[PDB]
């Protein structure tokens, strides 16, 4: 019921961007589940459902597809991290 109720909320207030931010960062999920005082077992069932909701939103909204701008914006904001992580990887091997 509660989880079912929560999903109907993430569709009202939360934007797809904000939902992904919540799903992608583990610091963010904790601040969410702990602040909500959720049980751990129910927490995973919920994290599973939002992933599901996040996936249904992406299919629906071409803006989040490869050619979609929200995707390329997400990809632009993530780029500085991927670059440095790949740079560090190479130094080791090389």
């Amino acid at each position: 019921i509660f989880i079912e109720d929560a999903i109907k909320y993430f569709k009202e207030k939360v934007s797809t961007q904000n939902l992904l931010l919540l799903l992608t960062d583990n610091e963010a999920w904790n601040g969410f589940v702990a602040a909500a005082e959720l049980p751990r077992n129910e927490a995973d069932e919920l994290r599973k459902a939002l992933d599901n909701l996040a996936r249904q939103m992406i299919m629906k909204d071409k803006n989040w597809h490869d050619k979609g701008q929200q995707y390329r914006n997400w990809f632009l904001k993530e780029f500085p991290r991927l670059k440095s992580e790949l740079e560090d990887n190479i130094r080791r091997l090389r």
């Epitope: 569709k11 299919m59 629906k60 071409k62 803006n63 597809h65 490869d66 050619k67 701008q69």
Partner: antibody, heavy 119, light 110 residues
Framework: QVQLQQSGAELARPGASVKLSCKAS????????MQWLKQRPGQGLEWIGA????????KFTQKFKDKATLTADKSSTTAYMQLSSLASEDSAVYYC????????????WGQGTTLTVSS | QAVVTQESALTTSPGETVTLTCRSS?????????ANWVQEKPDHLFTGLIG???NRAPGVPARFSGSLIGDKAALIITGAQTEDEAIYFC?????????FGGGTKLTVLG
């Protein structure tokens, strides 16, 4: 085979309202945005709005927000467009077309409803 | 309020390559605008040709291709046939709505 079958009143009075309908068959109705367009006599296509029969979400050009109302029936798989406050500029042929979800092209089209707004 | 611009008219001959273009008033046409082309033939026969700038719809001949050149979106007909005499509409996506251009009337000589 995907088919789009349109229907609706072909004559309306000024200031009145009318509801046009688009019956979809041959695919998963909830999965694709249903487009609505118009072509006035002697002009090109104009896009009005779209609806996602999955959750009833809609999109509009500002111009048509308080004029066109988009709805969809999941069970009969028919999209509807209600037009309000009809005027002369609303006389046109109205088309419904599917936006292929991942193609993004408009692949299948209704045969169009001809609407005249006159007294 | 966004404005989409196409050539009003172009001529070509059988066999030749011809290019139609689409321009956006807000800036360069990008992948996020999902450049969409539809062909209008007599008795209001509309046919979806291209989606997302270069996705060619099933059933569309190979001689049609789509691309972002410029600045703009382009429709290329590599070896035009007399049966390609039509009006070509280009539509751009602006976040939450499509805007159509005025269309190009393509004449095939001969």
């Amino acid at each position: 085979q995907v088919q789009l079958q349109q229907s609706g009143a072909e004559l309306a009075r000024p200031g009145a309202s009318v509801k046009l309908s688009c019956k979809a068959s041959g695919y998963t109705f909830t999965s694709h945005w249903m487009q609505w367009l118009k072509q006035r006599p002697g002009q090109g296509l104009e896009w009005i709005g779209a609806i996602y029969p999955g959750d009833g979400d809609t999109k509009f050009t500002q111009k048509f927000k308080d004029k066109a109302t988009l709805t969809a029936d999941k069970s009969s798989t028919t999209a509807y467009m209600q037009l309000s406050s009809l005027a002369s500029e609303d006389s046109a042929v109205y088309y419904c077309a599917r936006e292929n979800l991942y193609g993004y092209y408009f692949d299948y089209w209704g045969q169009g409803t001809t609407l005249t707004v006159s007294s | 309020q966004a404005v989409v611009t196409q050539e009003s008219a172009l001529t070509t001959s059988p066999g030749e390559t011809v290019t139609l273009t689409c321009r956006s008033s807000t800036g360069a046409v990008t992948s996020g605008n999902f450049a969409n082309w539809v062909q209008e033939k007599p008795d209001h026969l509309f046919t979806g040709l291209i989606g997302g700038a270069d996705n060619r719809a099933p059933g569309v001949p190979a001689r049609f291709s789509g691309s972002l050149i410029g600045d703009k979106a382009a429709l290329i007909i590599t070896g035009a046939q007399t049966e390609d005499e039509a009006i070509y509409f280009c539509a751009l996506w602006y976040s939450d709505h499509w805007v159509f251009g005025g269309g190009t009337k393509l004449t095939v000589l001969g």
